[PDB]
Structure formats: C-alpha cells, structure tokens
Amino acid sequence: LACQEITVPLCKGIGYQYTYMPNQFNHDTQDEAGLEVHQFWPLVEIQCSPDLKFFLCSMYTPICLEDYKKPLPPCRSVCERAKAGCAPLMRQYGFAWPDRMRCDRLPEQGNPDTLCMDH
Amino acid sequence: LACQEITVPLCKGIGYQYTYMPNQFNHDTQDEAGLEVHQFWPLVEIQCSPDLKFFLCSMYTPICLEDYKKPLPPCRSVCERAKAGCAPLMRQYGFAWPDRMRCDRLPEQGNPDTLCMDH
Amino acid sequence: AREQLKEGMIKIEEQGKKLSETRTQEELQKYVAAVATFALQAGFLEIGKISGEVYLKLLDLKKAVRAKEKKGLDILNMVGEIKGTLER
Amino acid sequence: AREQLKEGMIKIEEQGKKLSETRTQEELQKYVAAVATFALQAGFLGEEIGKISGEVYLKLLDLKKAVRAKEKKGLDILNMVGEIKGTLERV
C-alpha cells in the first residue's frame, strides 16, 4: 500500500489527504473511483446526512497512512447514519441503497480483527 | 517639449495619456503639479460637474500631440460647464472660483484662428 | 412531473440571479460622496498631507471594488454555463 | 459645527457598512441546493446524463472557488474602509 495524495475533488478536505489503490471496488485509479463518487454529488450537496461525504470517500478513496499499513474501513455506525438520513430521500426519487454500500458488510467498533474510524 | 506620459493619478484615463512640462503654471515636474491638482479631489469625487476632471487636467497636465505640436487648451464651454456645476457648491463652503481658472482666458469653440478641446 | 422540473429550473435561475448580483459601485459611489462631503466640511481645499492620504486610499478602495466586481462578473458567467449545461 | 462633522462621520460609517457587506457565500448555499434538487428530479443518480452530471458538479466546484474568492475581496474592502476611518480621525 503506497500512499497517493487524493485528487478526487469530492474527497478533498475530508480529514485525510492520502489514499491507496486499488480500493474495495477494485478501482485501479482515482480517476476511475472519482467517476463513481461524483455520481453521488446531488445527495452530498443537499446534506441529507453529515456523514455521507466521509462514508463514500472512506470506501472509494480509503485512508492511507505510511505509519499504519493496515486498511481501516468506516464503522457500521457511519454507514447507518448516512443511510438513515439519505435513504428516505433516495427512495422518494426511486433509487435504492446500493448493495456495494450495505452497512452489514462493514465492521462494528470493538472488532478484534479490524479497526475502524468514527468520530 | 517632449511629450511625457501622465503619471498624476487624478489625470489617468481622461482621454489622453501624454503631456508636457512645464505647464502654464510653470510647474517643473508632474509631482509638483500633482500635489496641487489633487487638492481638488473632493469636488471631483462628488461629481458636481462631469467636465471638472477633464478641465483641471487639461491645464495642469496639458495634452501633448504629435500631430499638433502647439498647446491646445480646453474651450471656454468646458470651463463654463465645470464652473456652473461646482462653483455654487464651492461658494457654500467658503471657496470662490480660483482666478487662475477664469474661463475668459480660454478660447471659444468654433473659431478658425485658434483650436480648443471639447469632448 | 414534467411541470415540477420546469419550476425547479426557474427557481435555480432566481437563486442564480441574486448570487451573481453585484451592485457594489452604487454603494461605492455613495461612500465616496460621503467622504468627499466630509472632506469639504473639514476644509481640505498641514492638512494637505491628510487630504493627500485620503485620496490615495480612496483610489486603492476603488480598485478593490472593481476587483470584487470582476469576481462577481466571473460568478455571473459561471451560473450561465451551469444553466446551459442543465438545459441539455 | 463640530457636531456636523460628527454627523458627516456617521454618514461615512453607515455607507462603509453597506459597501463592505459581501454575503456571497450565504446566497451560494441556496443556489447549490436548487441545482442539486433539479439533479435529483432529472435522475442524475445511476447514458448521456452521466457525462452531464459530471460536468455540472465540476462547474459548481469552480463556482464555489469564485464565491470564496469574491468573499476574500470583500474583506480587503472592509480592511481599507477601516484605514480610511482612521485617517479621517486625525481631523
């Protein structure tokens, strides 16, 4: 995991500046991952959930630390907060919560195998 | 006798950029004339007359033209318009129209003998 | 449904109009007139040094206003391109 | 007479407040919300719309930069009118 500075415009200033490739969706470049997070931009600007921008970026552009060389995904709570805030508005326009963004795939905090980030 | 680019801030963008020294008031430098013309800035900024800014500069920084290498003053009408607009406001604050700017010394427009400027 | 999208577009144009609106100079000219009036009442026509410093700062102020007006104009062009991009 | 100059001073302070007022970014939030709603009603979430949706968001980020730039110039105007008030205080 060699850290690369984040160039995805939607994911700048989220809390961390470095990421790695490939991500959980097997995107080889940030430009490939950028094309999918920018498809979520209307939900992000409306601010249906304050955790939406961080949750999306924590998966498409996962944080990279040269000191801590282990992948750390977002905690389940981050996903469920973003879902509870935006999925009703999503359902109002006929769009369901993507299966790739299912919260059950993420680990809960307190997990012995992997560490996750939540404020 | 050689045309010099106007450096007086109050006289920039008046219609011409080149002047000569000394002027009719025997000012040796533009900085000497600039310190005296800038004393009229409150009258200019209030905009009591649209012709005041041009009239003042046409005397302190007289126009220099490569086609007509003779002094070209403003027409009396330019003075009379600038005078009629600002002299009442001057008199209200206890200042009379300076004798050095008396309109009668200038030529009237339409005379073939002498030419003058009226934008 | 189609009517709802039409009303959304005029609502965007309405919000874009106030965003791009500048109108700074009308406030600037009123300011310069107020300063020049005070300059007359103080007898600006040793005080000459004070009068010179005021006029030089006013010219710097007017530059910044035109600079703010220029950025406001760039905002006006950008909201036009967004409206054009949304029309397709 | 001295009171009239004080009234001239409060006239300057009043006009400086309206001159220095910017408030561009507060107006920006309403615009971005209006555009984002239209993006949802047009079904920007998911052939041609994918390219259109990308072009709109990139322009919005440049707009947000310009708004932040215009907001910065407003402070420079606010700083200069403060220095002018100080120079007028010498009277």
Side-chain angles (χ1 to χ4, degrees), chain D residues 25-46 49-50 52-56:
Chain D
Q25 183 167 355
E26 309 175 1
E27 295 166 348
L28 172 64
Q29 294 176 347
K30 291 290 186 181
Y31 179 81
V32 181
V35 177
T37 295
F38 180 87
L40 292 180
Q41 296 178 339
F44 280 24
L45 300 178
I49 296 181
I52 300 184
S53 186
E55 296 178 358
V56 174

Coordinates of all heavy atoms in Angstrom, one line a residue, chain D residues 25-56, unseen atoms left out:
Chain D
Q25 N -21.4 34.0 -0.1 CA -21.5 32.5 0.2 C -22.8 32.1 0.8 O -23.3 31.0 0.5 CB -20.3 32.1 1.1 CG -20.3 30.6 1.3 CD -19.0 30.2 1.9 OE1 -18.1 30.9 2.1 NE2 -18.9 28.9 2.3
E26 N -23.4 33.0 1.6 CA -24.7 32.7 2.2 C -25.8 32.5 1.0 O -26.7 31.7 1.1 CB -25.2 33.8 3.1 CG -24.1 34.1 4.2 CD -24.6 35.3 5.1 OE1 -25.7 35.8 4.8 OE2 -23.8 35.7 5.9
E27 N -25.7 33.3 0.0 CA -26.5 33.2 -1.2 C -26.2 31.9 -2.0 O -27.0 31.4 -2.7 CB -26.5 34.4 -2.1 CG -27.0 35.7 -1.4 CD -26.6 36.9 -2.1 OE1 -25.8 36.9 -3.0 OE2 -27.2 38.0 -1.8
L28 N -24.9 31.5 -1.9 CA -24.5 30.3 -2.7 C -25.2 29.0 -2.2 O -25.5 28.2 -3.0 CB -23.0 30.2 -2.6 CG -22.3 28.9 -3.2 CD1 -22.6 28.8 -4.7 CD2 -20.9 28.8 -2.8
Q29 N -25.4 28.9 -0.9 CA -26.0 27.7 -0.4 C -27.4 27.4 -1.0 O -27.7 26.3 -1.3 CB -26.0 27.7 1.1 CG -24.7 27.7 1.8 CD -24.7 27.9 3.3 OE1 -25.8 28.2 3.8 NE2 -23.6 27.6 4.0
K30 N -28.2 28.5 -1.1 CA -29.5 28.3 -1.8 C -29.4 27.9 -3.2 O -30.2 27.1 -3.7 CB -30.3 29.6 -1.7 CG -30.7 30.0 -0.3 CD -31.8 29.1 0.2 CE -32.4 29.6 1.6 NZ -33.4 28.7 2.1
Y31 N -28.4 28.4 -3.9 CA -28.2 28.0 -5.3 C -27.8 26.6 -5.5 O -28.4 25.8 -6.3 CB -27.2 28.9 -6.0 CG -26.9 28.6 -7.4 CD1 -27.8 29.1 -8.4 CD2 -25.8 27.9 -7.8 CE1 -27.5 28.8 -9.8 CE2 -25.5 27.6 -9.2 CZ -26.4 28.1 -10.1 OH -26.2 27.8 -11.4
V32 N -26.8 26.1 -4.7 CA -26.4 24.7 -4.8 C -27.5 23.8 -4.4 O -27.6 22.7 -5.0 CB -25.1 24.5 -3.9 CG1 -24.6 23.1 -4.0 CG2 -24.0 25.5 -4.3
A33 N -28.3 24.1 -3.5 CA -29.5 23.3 -3.1 C -30.5 23.2 -4.2 O -31.1 22.2 -4.5 CB -30.1 23.8 -1.8
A34 N -30.7 24.4 -4.9 CA -31.6 24.4 -6.0 C -31.1 23.5 -7.2 O -31.9 22.8 -7.8 CB -31.9 25.8 -6.5
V35 N -29.8 23.6 -7.5 CA -29.3 22.8 -8.5 C -29.3 21.3 -8.2 O -29.6 20.4 -9.0 CB -27.8 23.2 -8.9 CG1 -27.2 22.3 -9.9 CG2 -27.8 24.7 -9.3
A36 N -29.0 21.0 -6.9 CA -28.9 19.6 -6.5 C -30.3 18.9 -6.6 O -30.5 17.7 -6.9 CB -28.3 19.4 -5.1
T37 N -31.4 19.7 -6.2 CA -32.7 19.2 -6.3 C -33.1 18.9 -7.8 O -33.7 17.8 -8.1 CB -33.7 20.2 -5.7 OG1 -33.5 20.3 -4.3 CG2 -35.1 19.7 -5.9
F38 N -32.8 19.8 -8.7 CA -33.0 19.6 -10.1 C -32.3 18.3 -10.6 O -32.8 17.6 -11.4 CB -32.6 20.8 -10.9 CG -32.8 20.6 -12.4 CD1 -34.1 20.9 -13.0 CD2 -31.8 20.2 -13.2 CE1 -34.2 20.8 -14.3 CE2 -32.0 20.1 -14.6 CZ -33.2 20.4 -15.1
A39 N -31.0 18.1 -10.1 CA -30.3 17.0 -10.5 C -31.0 15.7 -10.0 O -30.9 14.7 -10.8 CB -28.9 17.0 -9.9
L40 N -31.6 15.7 -8.9 CA -32.3 14.5 -8.4 C -33.6 14.3 -9.3 O -33.9 13.1 -9.6 CB -32.7 14.6 -7.0 CG -31.5 14.6 -6.0 CD1 -32.0 14.7 -4.6 CD2 -30.7 13.3 -6.2
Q41 N -34.4 15.3 -9.5 CA -35.6 15.2 -10.3 C -35.3 14.7 -11.7 O -36.2 14.1 -12.4 CB -36.4 16.5 -10.3 CG -36.9 16.9 -8.9 CD -37.6 18.2 -8.9 OE1 -37.5 19.0 -9.8 NE2 -38.4 18.4 -7.8
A42 N -34.2 15.1 -12.3 CA -33.8 14.7 -13.6 C -33.2 13.3 -13.7 O -32.9 12.8 -14.7 CB -32.8 15.7 -14.3
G43 N -33.0 12.7 -12.5 CA -32.5 11.3 -12.4 C -31.0 11.2 -12.7 O -30.6 10.4 -13.5
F44 N -30.2 12.1 -12.1 CA -28.8 12.1 -12.3 C -28.1 11.0 -11.6 O -26.9 10.7 -11.8 CB -28.2 13.4 -11.8 CG -28.3 14.6 -12.7 CD1 -29.3 14.6 -13.7 CD2 -27.4 15.6 -12.7 CE1 -29.4 15.6 -14.6 CE2 -27.5 16.7 -13.6 CZ -28.5 16.7 -14.6
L45 N -28.8 10.3 -10.7 CA -28.3 9.1 -10.0 C -28.3 7.9 -10.8 O -29.3 7.6 -11.5 CB -29.0 8.9 -8.7 CG -29.0 10.0 -7.6 CD1 -29.8 9.7 -6.4 CD2 -27.6 10.4 -7.3
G46 N -27.3 7.1 -10.8 CA -27.2 5.9 -11.6 C -26.0 5.0 -11.3 O -26.0 3.8 -11.4
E47 N -27.7 7.5 -20.2 CA -26.3 7.3 -20.8 C -25.6 8.7 -20.9 O -24.5 8.9 -20.4 CB -26.4 6.7 -22.1
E48 N -26.3 9.7 -21.5 CA -25.8 11.0 -21.6 C -25.7 11.7 -20.3 O -24.9 12.7 -20.1 CB -26.6 11.8 -22.7
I49 N -26.6 11.4 -19.4 CA -26.7 12.1 -18.1 C -25.4 11.9 -17.3 O -25.0 12.8 -16.5 CB -27.9 11.7 -17.3 CG1 -29.2 12.1 -18.1 CG2 -28.0 12.3 -15.9 CD1 -30.5 11.7 -17.4
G50 N -24.8 10.8 -17.4 CA -23.5 10.6 -16.6 C -22.5 11.6 -16.9 O -21.8 12.1 -16.0
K51 N -22.3 11.9 -18.2 CA -21.4 13.0 -18.6 C -21.9 14.4 -18.2 O -21.1 15.2 -17.7 CB -21.1 13.0 -20.1
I52 N -23.2 14.6 -18.3 CA -23.8 15.9 -17.9 C -23.7 16.1 -16.4 O -23.3 17.2 -16.0 CB -25.3 16.0 -18.4 CG1 -25.3 15.8 -19.9 CG2 -25.9 17.3 -17.9 CD1 -26.7 16.0 -20.5
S53 N -24.0 15.0 -15.6 CA -23.9 15.2 -14.2 C -22.4 15.5 -13.7 O -22.2 16.3 -12.8 CB -24.4 13.9 -13.5 OG -24.4 14.0 -12.1
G54 N -21.5 14.9 -14.4 CA -20.1 15.2 -14.1 C -19.7 16.6 -14.4 O -18.9 17.3 -13.7
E55 N -20.2 17.1 -15.5 CA -19.8 18.5 -15.9 C -20.5 19.5 -15.0 O -19.9 20.6 -14.8 CB -20.3 18.7 -17.4 CG -19.5 17.9 -18.4 CD -20.0 18.1 -19.8 OE1 -20.9 18.9 -20.0 OE2 -19.4 17.5 -20.8
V56 N -21.7 19.2 -14.5 CA -22.3 20.2 -13.6 C -21.6 20.3 -12.3 O -21.4 21.4 -11.8 CB -23.8 19.8 -13.4 CG1 -24.5 20.7 -12.4 CG2 -24.6 19.8 -14.7

